[PDB]
Design a protein around this ligand. Structure first.
Ligand SMILES: [Mg+2]
Ligand SMILES: [Mg+2]
Ligand code: NA
Lengths: 138, 142, 153, 221
RNA sequence: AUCGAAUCGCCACCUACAAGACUGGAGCUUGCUCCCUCGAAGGCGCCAAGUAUAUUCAUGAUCACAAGACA
RNA sequence: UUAGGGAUAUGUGGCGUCAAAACUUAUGGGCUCAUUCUCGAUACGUAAAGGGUGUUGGUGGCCACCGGCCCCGAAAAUGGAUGACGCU
């Protein structure tokens, strides 16, 4: 209401600025859980199949053999985590399951992964997997 | 030579003192530091930022959580950092470690400045590494 | 217009172990295959190439079919088609691609700062010229609102 | 679906921003129907969110009469004792594409149902999609690389309007108005585009020299 | 108000349109030659608002969902 | 050809989606267009004579004959099947 003066000042200041993204970096690659190893007869759930962005070749997929892999999700209640006492800021409904890359699959860059002591749940099919850069050989 | 001797190591040649490394995990993930030495008995590496540039103090780190690039800085600092410096009894920094930090960092900064390409190396140490959409780290040289 | 397949025509290899190398057509076998050689390159001895794997360039050294290596070397040198090919932007793009493929973390950092410097100076120059001739959305709106503000307020 | 008042109340209480999920918009003009469907179904199973536009411009190999006869053979399938239960034959091009994709998914399973519900299809380009960003194509399913040029081919909207689709003229008029609007705006933005081009061309004198050398070495001159 | 949660690029320079037997512009020798935009990059973003001896980072103690957060 | 479980490699059969595998491989060669059951496409397993300048080659003398794919010849009873979608 007769306060066009505020909108008059904002235009005059307007210079060329950009968003510039200076935030906490991500140190992993994005993959997806395609499914389990299977044939026409049925599936074996002890091995999972993972497809990673920009990895489209068997030679590419060999680079990741041995790297660690994570599936992040959430539950309904807050339960125990690592550093539950030392760092109370970590406490949440967020949880993760860990595994390792074992070998490539096919010629197109898919890889086989094995999880620690148990199978990954089938509710993760079609969802995101983190593939880290460690342990490192470089 | 003897495996029981503390001098015995198996570290890969890329992680040699003076090499500039990228941190892959921990509180300082993504920062770049300088490898000072490896602790005895085939122990971890010790790295420092220096803390003026990127804020990374003297710290132990496993060589499996590091990428050792081919860029190097010539270091001839006193390097009097044993295992006891990082062992503690059963914003707050002790007056001994606080002094050791300065004694090392001044020498490290003098070495970087004395090096050619010193300004570029300082900026390189100040920058932060990240994985962008569309990136393919498996295809790169380091 | 298009560059015909003919004896003496320069080509670039598309895929395979000889990718992004330049040769000269010395003979046509049939609709699918040619014989290619480049004396001034190490891996381009006389060999067979499928016509789906080549890219015809704009230069043709004038030679007859199944010519000798001696007669093709000097014809190349006199034509100076290689010194001409090295000056185009597609040749420079190929060399840039190789240089980028073989690069260290330090060099990638150098390129990043060079591009940031260019962008900063470009946006500065743009702001200065937009001050004179208003072309940004905010400057167009400012000039549209100035006349209204001159009255009343 | 109109959002509920409880959702609006929660959004106000949280005080967040306007959220948009990650969506890929595919321009389907001059794409091969079966190959585009085969690629899209696999991406949907891998978990993407996809919207397709310009479904009336898909292509099928062969003549229009042959393809129309195939459709009429499909149309005559009908549960004799009660046709309100028999196969339902959709006539619009976007519904044709959706059925083709549905046949390449495990529809009876919930996973298949989620994948199918993650796809949206349109005829033409609607105004709620026009401004969302650059559209994409599928290189391995384009006509100019898939068909030999000498053979005849069909256009899906032309085939559909003879078996019963009744909105071809509406879509044509809408697309005409759309293209005129976009062209006028594009021409209006030319001064801005040229100013930015000139600014980049001229900053090479004001930057430091040793940066320009790196640009030249990596081919960004 | 429950609510802690999975997701980890942004743009008022992409977010207009057509062709692929053919496609910057000229010739006449219609497949060669000559001209110059050289015909194989949307723009930014990745730690000093910008390429320059400026500057707090620790004890969160060697991995753990990024203890951060929607540039 | 078979005790209860891991890893590696194979057989028959496969590698557009359903559905693991060439994210539709090759920097291999030929051939083929089929309009109301319909080109064709996993053996065992559920169409003939005769015609065709449709197209591709072969023998002997622009001709006569012999081939390869495709097209007529080819007509039943609820709506429906290369397994489905589709593929040129
Ligand atoms: Mg967390
Ligand atoms: Mg598969
Ligand atoms: Na089958």
């Amino acid at each position: 209401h007769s306060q066009r003066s505020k909108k008059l000042h904002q235009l005059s200041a307007k210079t060329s600025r950009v968003n510039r993204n200076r935030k906490a970096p991500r140190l992993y690659m994005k993959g997806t859980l395609a499914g389990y190893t299977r044939g026409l007869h049925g599936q074996t759930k002890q091995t999972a199949l993972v497809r990673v962005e920009n990895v489209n070749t068997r030679e590419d997929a060999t680079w990741y053999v041995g790297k660690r892999v994570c599936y992040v999700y959430h539950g309904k209640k807050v339960k125990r985590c690592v550093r539950w006492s030392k760092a109370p800021a970590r406490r949440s409904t967020t949880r993760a399951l860990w595994g390792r890359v074992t070998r490539p699959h096919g010629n197109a860059g898919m890889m086989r992964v094995k999880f620690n002591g148990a199978s990954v749940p089938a509710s993760a099919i079609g969802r995101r997997i983190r593939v880290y850069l460690y342990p490192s050989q470089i | 030579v003897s495996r029981k001797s503390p001098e015995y190591t198996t570290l890969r040649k890329s992680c040699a003192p003076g090499a500039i490394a990228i941190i892959l995990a921990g509180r300082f993930r993504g920062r770049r530091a300088v490898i000072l030495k490896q602790l005895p008995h085939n122990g971890p590496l010790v790295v420092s930022g220096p803390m003026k540039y990127n804020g990374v103090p003297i710290r132990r780190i496993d060589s499996r959580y590091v990428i050792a690039t081919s860029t190097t800085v010539d270091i001839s600092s006193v390097d009097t950092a044993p295992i006891t410096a990082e062992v503690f009894q059963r914003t707050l920094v002790s007056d001994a470690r606080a002094q050791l930090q300065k004694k090392i960092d001044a020498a490290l900064i003098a070495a970087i400045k004395k090096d050619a390409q010193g300004k570029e190396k300082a900026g390189y140490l100040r920058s932060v590494f990240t994985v962008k959409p569309g990136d393919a780290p498996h295809r790169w040289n380091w | 217009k298009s560059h015909y397949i003919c004896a003496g025509r320069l080509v670039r290899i598309l895929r395979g172990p000889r990718q992004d190398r330049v040769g000269v057509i010395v003979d046509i076998v049939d609709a699918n295959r040619v014989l290619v050689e480049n004396p001034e390159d190490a891996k381009m001895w006389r060999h067979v190439q499928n016509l789906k794997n080549v890219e015809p360039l704009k230069y043709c050294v004038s030679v007859s079919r199944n010519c000798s290596a001696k007669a093709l070397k000097d014809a190349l040198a006199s034509s100076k088609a290689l010194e001409k090919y090295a000056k185009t932007r597609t040749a420079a793009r190929v060399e840039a691609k190789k240089a980028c493929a073989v690069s260290t973390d330090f060099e990638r950092y150098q390129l990043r700062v060079a591009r940031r410097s260019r962008a900063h100076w470009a946006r500065k120059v743009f702001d200065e010229k937009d001050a004179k001739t208003p072309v940004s959305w905010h400057k167009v709106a400012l000039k549209k609102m100035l006349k209204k503000a001159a009255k009343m307020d | 679906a109109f959002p509920s008042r409880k959702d609006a109340f929660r959004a106000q209480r949280k005080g967040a921003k306007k959220h948009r999920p990650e969506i890929i918009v595919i321009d389907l003009k001059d794409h091969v129907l079966g190959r585009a469907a085969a690629v899209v179904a696999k991406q949907l199973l891998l978990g993407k969110k996809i919207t397709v536009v310009r479904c009336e411009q898909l292509n099928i190999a062969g003549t229009e009469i042959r393809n129309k006869i195939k459709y009429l053979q499909y149309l005559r399938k009908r549960k004799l004792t009660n046709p309100t239960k028999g196969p339902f034959h959709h006539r619009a091009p976007s519904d044709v594409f959706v059925r083709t994709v549905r046949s390449m998914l495990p529809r009876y399973t919930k996973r298949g149902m989620k994948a199918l519900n993650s796809l949206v299809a349109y005829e033409g380009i609607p105004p709620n999609v026009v401004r969302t960003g650059g559209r994409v194509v599928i290189p391995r399913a384009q006509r100019h690389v898939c068909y030999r040029s000498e053979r005849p081919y069909t256009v899906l909207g032309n085939m559909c309007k003879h078996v019963g689709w009744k909105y071809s003229d509406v879509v044509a008029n809408l697309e005409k108005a759309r293209v005129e609007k976009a062209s006028r705006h594009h021409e209006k933005q030319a001064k801005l585009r040229d100013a930015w081009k000139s600014a980049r061309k001229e900053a090479l004198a004001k930057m430091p020299k040793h940066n320009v050398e790196v640009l030249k070495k990596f081919g960004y001159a």
